């Protein structure tokens, strides 16, 4: 009985919601709020704890990009602070390898990061690893075959169709085949040994196209597009299916949750968030 | 100074 | 009958509006939208054509600083692109001398410019001229006695009360007396041979004070404050009075338009914009 958690996000300002969808019975749980509202954050689960990483806070006094790492324990319904990252990272990407959290890219004000750092829960500390080849914010991150892939994003002057792959044992990055489409703020995840990149912003419009990467053929292939165009969408995989949550379609902040079935190659809408929003962190546990 | 988010 | 034109601005995101106010009969016209929304731009008129210069498109998808020069023809209700500036300039200041447009300061990413460039409509060409002595964004620009004054702003570290003066024939800049107040994002204009600086942000508060510079005595003098504190306001002079449009007061995007009568030294509220906004460009033709 694993739940899809969605944390934070953006609707007229950074949000503090933590809510959880149960795909088996279709209900939403309202859990304890983030202590600090943030949009542009990422979520992930390690050892049954939920982590909320990075992002951006809007407050009466001004805007603050976040270096925070916060931990939610579903047993106690309580958030606790963990050690903060070396730098603030808004529009961060995150992936998990061997119980370690990788924070990749993101921005601090006008600074567009190529640095990457690694968190070890057992010691509660962060260490920098090798930096990416490209500065990327709005980057999608996916973990496959114990490698970390960073897909698309914005390097500070151009929105990117490029992607690169990180080798944890060698501690190095190598560029891989570029996507068919430029995308920043896409949903990127792994399903059935393929990397999917859904939606995003190509510099002109929000996108509803979806493409997937096969690591052995080294080619990106379009699959069925989503019903709604969306950028800054949340994404995760639950029981063989991709779920995309929220995002911005150019006019509205979506509450739509769509579900992709790879067997049938079709998207269907499965629920609505309790309110429309973009820029959420999403994880499953 | 500008109110932008 | 000349109109007060207001272009672009920001409310939830950068805007595309072009609207014109007729002060003699109190009406607002809705004209053709800008091709690309922007806030932090500047407006001016040369030869009956309206120009929109610089700014930044801040959208929920991300931000893009602008180097664009766009030309609006009131006879055709059509925008046309002109040659772009050498660099993007967000929160630019502009002044016109002898039919040439000077673009001063502004930001591009981390860069706070001191460079200055001049546009010649007859050739559709930009050329750099001497740079200012200080980097300034959010700077107010005024033209008086065929000299160009750059007033206040933000140098990348501190907000400024300094001001300086450009000599087109000699192509050089000189500091002049500093204002009584630090002001970034003030409205600056020329009325009856004086330079006025209204509103802005002093580092702690949005301002409602107004001060004016007499070039012969070289002193700045407060006049009557505006009714509403405001920063990133639009400003222009029409039939011997100063009009200030919109702005941010720390909590609200203003729709208030106030009008200064130098004869009685009083401000009155004259109209409201169709919706509140900050960072407009404004001009009269
Ligand atoms: Na922080
Ligand atoms: Na590879
Ligand atoms: Na985006
Ligand atoms: Na700005
Ligand atoms: Na915004
Ligand atoms: Na540049
Ligand atoms: Na600079």
Kindly describe this structure.
Chains A, C: This is Kelch-like ECH-associated protein 1. Chains A, C: It comes from Homo sapiens (Human). Chains A, C: It is found in: Cytoplasm; Nucleus. Chains A, C: Belongs to the KEAP1 family. The complex is a heterotrimer, with 2 copies of chain A (285 residues) and 1 copy of chain B (5 residues). Chain A is an all-beta fold. Chain A has a single domain, classed as Neuraminidase (6 Propeller), CATH 2.120.10. In chain A, 0% of the residues lie in helices and 48% in strands. Chain A is built from no helices and 28 strands. Chain B is mostly loops. The N and C termini of chain B lie close together (11 Å). Chains A and C meet through loops of A and loops of C. Bound molecules: sodium ion (7 copies).
Short overview:
Chain A has 285 residues and is mostly beta strands.
Short key terms for the protein model shown above:
heterotrimer; A: 285 residues; mainly beta; Neuraminidase; four-stranded antiparallel beta sheet; 28 strands; 0% helix; 48% strand; B: 5 residues; little secondary structure; rod-shaped; binds sodium ion; Kelch-like ECH-associated protein 1 (chains A, C)
Strand runs of chain A, count: 28
Give the end-to-end Cα distance of chain A, rounded to a whole number of Å: 8 Å
Structural class of chain A: mainly beta
Domain module count of chain A:
1
What's the story with the biggest beta sheet of chain B?
none
Taken from the alpha-carbon principal axes, the silhouette of chain B is rod-shaped
CATH architecture tag of chain A:
6 Propeller
Family (chains A, C): Belongs to the KEAP1 family.
Main location (chains A, C): cytoplasm
Subcellular location (chains A, C): Cytoplasm; Nucleus
Kelch repeats (chains A, C): 3-48, 49-99, 100-146, 147-193, 194-240, 241-285
Outline the secondary-structure elements.
The complex is a heterotrimer, with two copies of chain A (285 residues) and one copy of chain B (5 residues).
Chain A: E1 4-7, E2 18-22, E3 27-30, E4 42-46, E5 49-53, E6 56-59, E7 62-65, E8 69-73, E9 78-81, E10 93-97, E11 100-104, E12 107-108, E13 111-112, E14 116-120, E15 125-128, E16 140-144, E17 147-154, E18 159-167, E19 172-176, E20 187-191, E21 194-198, E22 210-214, E23 219-223, E24 234-238, E25 241-245, E26 256-261, E27 266-272, E28 281-284
Antiparallel strand pairs in A: 1-2, 1-28, 2-3, 4-5, 5-8, 6-7, 8-9, 10-11, 11-14, 12-13, 14-15, 16-17, 17-18, 18-19, 20-21, 21-22, 22-23, 24-25, 25-26, 26-27
Chain B: no helix or strand
